[PDB]
Amino acid sequence: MNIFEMLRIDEGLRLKIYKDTEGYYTIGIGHLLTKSPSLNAAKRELDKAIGRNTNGVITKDEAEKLFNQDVDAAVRGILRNAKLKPVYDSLDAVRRAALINMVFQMGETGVAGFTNSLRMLQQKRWDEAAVNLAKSRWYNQTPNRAKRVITTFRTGTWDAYK
Ligand SMILES: [Cl-]
Ligand SMILES: [Cl-]
């Protein structure tokens, strides 16, 4: 199992504009298009992202191309962030994937907002960090996905995804 397969399980794949759990216009593998209510503002972002007139529909390849870009951006954003980088450097390969997942879903700013849990992860206090991560809007809004991510932090294995 790897970051790509893990995110593909959490986000799914959709070839037509859809609304995410928060109600925002999305497409592909969790690719956020816009927070605007306008389905047209969304089709516009979409064409701009793909470099063609899509009329809200893309192919598998296009979805995969956006997905590669997004994972790359997540990793690069972590490495460029003064609060995230030290955490990432401290972790093993599995737990590194769990942090990339959180960043992909909620952005760098969101994650950097989990100051206390991040400090616990750095100190390798696994059980304490899993408990603190659960006291969040994130866990309350997307409980099944949060549980999988949290178990990955607690155990350092891919168990929740197998
Ligand atoms: Cl883009
Ligand atoms: Cl969920």
Curated annotation (Swiss-Prot):
Effect seen on changing residue 30 to F: Almost complete loss of enzymatic activity. The enzyme is destabilized by 1.5 kcal/mol
Residues annotated to bind substrate: 32, 104, 117, 132
One CC-aspect GO term: host cell cytoplasm
Effect upon mutating residue 117 to I: 500-fold decrease in enzymatic activity
Organism superkingdom: Viruses
Stated consequence of mutating residue 20 to E/Q: Loss of 99% of enzymatic activity
EC id: 3.2.1.17
Active site positions: 11 (proton donor/acceptor), 20 (proton donor/acceptor)
InterPro entries: Endolysin_T4_type, Glyco_hydro_24, Lysozyme-like_dom_sf, Lysozyme_dom_sf, Phage_lysozyme-like, T4-type_lysozyme
pH dependence of this protein's activity: Optimum pH is 7.3.
UniProt-reported outcome of changing residue 117 to F: 10-fold decrease in enzymatic activity
Annotated HAMAP family: ENDOLYSIN_T4 (MF_04110)
Record's function text: Endolysin with lysozyme activity that degrades host peptidoglycans and participates with the holin and spanin proteins in the sequential events which lead to the programmed host cell lysis releasing the mature viral particles. Once the holin has permeabilized the host cell membrane, the endolysin can reach the periplasm and break down the peptidoglycan layer.
Family indicated by similarity: Belongs to the glycosyl hydrolase 24 family.
Record-given protein name: Endolysin
